[PDB]
Amino acid sequence: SKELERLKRIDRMKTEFIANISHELRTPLTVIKGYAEMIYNSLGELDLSTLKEFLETIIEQSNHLENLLNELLDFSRLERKSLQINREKVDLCDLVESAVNAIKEFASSHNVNVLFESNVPCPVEAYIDPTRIRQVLLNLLNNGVKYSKKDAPDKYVKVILDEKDGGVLIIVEDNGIGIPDHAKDRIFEQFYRVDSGLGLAITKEIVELHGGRIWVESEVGKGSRFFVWIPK
Amino acid sequence: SKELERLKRIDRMKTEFIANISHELRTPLTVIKGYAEMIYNSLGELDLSTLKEFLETIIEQSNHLENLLNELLDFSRLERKSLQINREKVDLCDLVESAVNAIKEFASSHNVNVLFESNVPCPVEAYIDPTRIRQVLLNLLNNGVKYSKKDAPDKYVKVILDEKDGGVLIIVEDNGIGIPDHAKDRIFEQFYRVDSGLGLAITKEIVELHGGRIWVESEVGKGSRFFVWIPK
Ligand SMILES: Nc1ncnc2c1ncn2[C@@H]1O[C@H](COP(=O)(O)OP(=O)(O)O)[C@@H](O)[C@H]1O
Numbered sequence: 367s368k369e370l371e372r373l374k375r376i377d378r379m380k381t382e383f384i385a386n387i388s389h390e391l392r393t394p395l396t397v398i399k400g401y402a403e404m405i406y407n408s409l410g411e412l413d414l415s416t417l418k419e420f421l422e423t424i425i426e427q428s429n430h431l432e433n434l435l436n437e438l439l440d441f442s443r444l445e446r447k448s449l450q451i452n453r454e455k456v457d458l459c460d461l462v463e464s465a466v467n468a469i470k471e472f473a474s475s476h477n478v479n480v481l482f483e484s485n486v487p488c489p490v491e492a493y494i495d496p497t498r499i500r501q502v503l504l505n506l507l508n509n510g511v512k513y514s515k516k517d518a519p520d521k522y523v524k525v526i527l528d529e530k531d532g533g534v535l536i537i538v539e540d541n542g543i544g545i546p547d548h549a550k551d552r553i554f555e556q557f558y559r560v561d562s563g564l565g566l567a568i569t570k571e572i573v574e575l576h577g578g579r580i581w582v583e584s585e586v587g588k589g590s591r592f593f594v595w596i597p598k
Numbered sequence: 599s600k601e602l603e604r605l606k607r608i609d610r611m612k613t614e615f616i617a618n619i620s621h622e623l624r625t626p627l628t629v630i631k632g633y634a635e636m637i638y639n640s641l642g643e644l645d646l647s648t649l650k651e652f653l654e655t656i657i658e659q660s661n662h663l664e665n666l667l668n669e670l671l672d673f674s675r676l677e678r679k680s681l682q683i684n685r686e687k688v689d690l691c692d693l694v695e696s697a698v699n700a701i702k703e704f705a706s707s708h709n710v711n712v713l714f715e716s717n718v719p720c721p722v723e724a725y726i727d728p729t730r731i732r733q734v735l736l737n738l739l740n741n742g743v744k745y746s747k748k749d750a751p752d753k754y755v756k757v758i759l760d761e762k763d764g765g766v767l768i769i770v771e772d773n774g775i776g777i778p779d780h781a782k783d784r785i786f787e788q789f790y791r792v793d794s795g796l797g798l799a800i801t802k803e804i805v806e807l808h809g810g811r812i813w814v815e816s817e818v819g820k821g822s823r824f825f826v827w828i829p830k
């Protein structure tokens with residue numbers, strides 16, 4: 367019954383995940399579909415200045431649809447364990463930088479500071495999928511800011527780049543609420559939370575696809591460190 | 599274990615349904631996104647004749663995306679039992695006609711004839727959802743053509759409109775492969791087949807939402823009759 371209860375909860379939360387993303391997909395479709403009809407029906411008469419503005423919207427809107435479609439695609443490829451990886455010779459220093467950069471504003475909204483130090487001279491080279499590893503970083507960093515300690519004067523998230531055992535190690539450090547001793551393996555299970563949009567499960571899969579491993583070290587209420595190791 | 603085996607198959611086929619529809623959604627997105635960028639980048643220079651042609655494609659393509667999005671939406675609303683209904687004063691004669699019309703070419707490709715006779719003078723009035731009841735008809739009719747008898751000289755599908763018990767009865771008749779005695783209730787279960795894209799489950803839900811009931815009568819290898827009754 368532990369399995370039957372497990373499966374009936376998974377099915378529950380898959381249903382909900384799908385219901386949400388279906389609904390999200392609908393709006394940009396409406397705007398695109400709408401804006402193309404506006405352009406179509408007024409075909410002769412439009413200002414170029416305004417033609418430009420209308421297309422910009424159809425473009426921007428189709429991008430939102432792509433992000434949403436890719437989130438739905440990822441969820442599916444995780445289920446079928448058919449998620450794939452496109453490795454490139456890339457510098458990890460600039461990529462980390464870029465992610466730290468990407469997250470900077472959100473971190474300010476919760477008064478958390480973002481920090482980077484590499485223990486090896488840049489550029490640090492690695493044959494990895496830049497987009498997928500960038501996504502791994504964003505998720506970890508994002509969580510650092512989300513689960514930071516409400517009563518901490520110096521809320522931070524830190525990224526430590528290094529070169530261990532013929533590969534690369536990446537630590538994401540945090541002075542937030544930490545993680546209890548029961549949930550340490552649990553938090554990498556899709557949809558799993560601590561109190562009663564793909565998260566750490568897809569991060570785990572990406573990392574393991576590269577051949578690496580991911581783990582956490584936490585003192586409850588004091589620190590959290592997420593470790594990511596990847597070969598060369 | 600009958601439940602545990604049932605659930606693990608459902609999860610199996612939901613996963614597959616999602617994987618398929620995600621993949622389908624991707625193409626029209628690419629074409630839309632592509633065609634808007636083509637128009638954007640050549641903004642000044644385009645022929646109106648060609649501007650017209652390009653928008654027609656973005657329009658047609660966004661329609662395909664809608665059909666696909668609605669199929670995904672329906673699947674979700676069936677799971678959450680949150681599918682809803684928009685009733686209109688409508689004539690059932692014209693609606694049946696329209697569906698018989700809609701299906702006419704496909705029926706020719708399998709050399710099946712489509713037929714309509716109403717046992718009450720048109721217009722037959724009913725407060726129903728036209729789109730959703732039209733969808734019910736399309737599914738039934740479609741199946742009549744799909745499961746018709748390979749060695750039958752006179753392959754047909756017939757729709758009988760009538761007015762029984764202060765409501766409406768609709769029979770869809772067929773001289774195909776029929777349905778065995780075990781599968782008569784089974785065929786209305788999502789994903790269920792006879793040998794080893796929402797089908798009869800969503801038809802059942804729509805009909806029951808209107809307050810009616812749906813059933814089948816079949817002699818194996820000779821006839822099939824699907825009954826649909828709806829109040830006024
Ligand atoms: N940096 C972190 N600090 C503390 N807890 C975390 C951190 N990252 C993740 N967790 C825990 O793991 C769970 C799963 O996280 P995740 O997969 O990123 O999804 P979400 O952040 O949307 O819950 C969270 O509910 C949280 O309890």
Ligand SMILES: Nc1ncnc2c1ncn2[C@@H]1O[C@H](COP(=O)(O)OP(=O)(O)O)[C@@H](O)[C@H]1O
Pocket residue numbers: 737738741742743744745772774775776777785790791792793796797798799822
């Ligand atoms: N008109 C029909 N004649 C014989 N069998 C049918 C008919 N309609 C449906 N069935 C049976 O019910 C099953 C489910 O049908 P449906 O939900 O329409 O999905 P699909 O047609 O894609 O299988 C089919 O596999 C078929 O065996």
